[PDB]
Design a protein around this ligand. Structure first.
Ligand code: ATP
Length: 319
């Protein structure tokens, strides 16, 4: 029974042909500090972390190493198959991926127990998962904003016409908030607080009425913890350059798009997928700066994984 696997920078999802998303686990491993060997993956790692056995540290590999990939894929595949035979595995990969890296991904999935492994670029999977008409001779456009990358693509006739990837996404919005608070308040906050600010009062623009938030961090003069209040308006300033860079990759992908496909997209709209697509008003801001309709996909966190699974029905194209 064939599997689609989305090993995301923070979240891993496994799709099983005929069952849907059957596995939702963090992209994390636990490694024994001294032996440097992986001893748990995903939920087994997170729970081992909560048992606290010492001599063990958690890592986020997808934030790269062939054996880590193989070990993680072996866990997720074995965990997902609740067994009819060695599976055929569709592996979602970032659009940037090079040939040597793509073959390293296939070989490690084979090592993990796949009969054979195929890859699908993330924007293509997201477009399939967002129900864009990717097989028709008309233009479609998806912007997938994850934790590590923003991937923009124009799809037509079952393939990517043009596509761009930038390393400016969810994690970079967090960093922009950290850096803004550092410069403005001489206060250093951690990544957990930055993430919460982004989710609770973050916006791409027009932050009126979103509200304010009390946050805590380290005063950089005294080194002592300090509490301040930050506003939606400030957070939107903090995120301005990140948002501008996403807008610019959408524009730059359009400028590389043939004219008729560009016309189809202006008519049907751009679809935003991924967790970063939930930044408040990002759809409106991309719409305003490009003069195009922009909508956030239904089920934006699962589009990629569902698209990876639906690609199993078209295994011939990826073989
Ligand atoms: N409400 C929200 N507002 C803004 N960002 C959010 C929200 N919810 C989640 N995110 C962001 O979504 C990102 C993770 O999204 P997603 O699960 O699609 O990524 P991923 O698949 O793990 O990563 P990648 O696609 O880069 O491999 C994180 O940066 C997270 O902060």
């Amino acid at each position: 029974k064939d599997l689609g696997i989305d090993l995301g920078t923070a979240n891993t999802l496994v799709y099983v042909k005929g069952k849907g998303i059957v596995l939702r686990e963090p992209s994390v491993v636990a490694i024994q500090r001294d032996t440097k060997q992986i001893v748990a993956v995903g939920n087994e790692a997170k729970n081992m972390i909560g048992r606290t056995p010492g001599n063990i540290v958690a890592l986020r590999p997808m934030k790269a190493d062939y054996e880590t990939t193989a070990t993680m894929m072996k866990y997720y595949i074995r965990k997902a198959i609740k067994f009819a035979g060695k599976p055929y595995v569709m592996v979602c990969v970032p659009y940037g991926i090079t040939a040597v890296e793509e073959r390293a991904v296939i070989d490690a999935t084979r090592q993990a127990g796949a009969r054979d492994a195929y890859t699908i670029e993330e924007p293509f999977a997201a477009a399939i998962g967002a129900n864009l008409p990717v097989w028709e001779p008309t233009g479609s456009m998806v912007v997938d904003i994850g934790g590590g990358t923003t991937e923009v693509a124009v799809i037509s006739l079952g393939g990517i016409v043009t596509s761009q990837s930038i390393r400016i996404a969810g994690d970079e919005m967090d960093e922009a908030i950290i850096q803004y608070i550092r410069k403005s308040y001489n206060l250093m906050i951690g990544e957990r607080t930055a993430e919460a600010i982004k989710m609770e009062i973050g916006s791409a623009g027009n932050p009126e009425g979103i509200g304010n938030m009390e946050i805590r961090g380290r005063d950089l003069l005294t080194g002592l913890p300090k509490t301040i209040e930050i506003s939606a308006e400030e957070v939107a300033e903090a995120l301005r350059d990140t948002v501008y860079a996403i807008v610019e990759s959408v524009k730059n992908t359009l400028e590389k798009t043939p004219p008729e496909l560009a016309a189809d997209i202006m008519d049907r709209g751009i679809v935003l997928t991924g967790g970063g697509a939930l930044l408040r008003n990002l759809d409106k801001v991309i719409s305003q700066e490009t003069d195009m309709p922009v909508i956030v996909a239904e089920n934006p966190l699962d589009c990629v994984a569902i698209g990876t699974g639906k690609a199993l029905d078209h295994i011939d194209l990826f073989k």
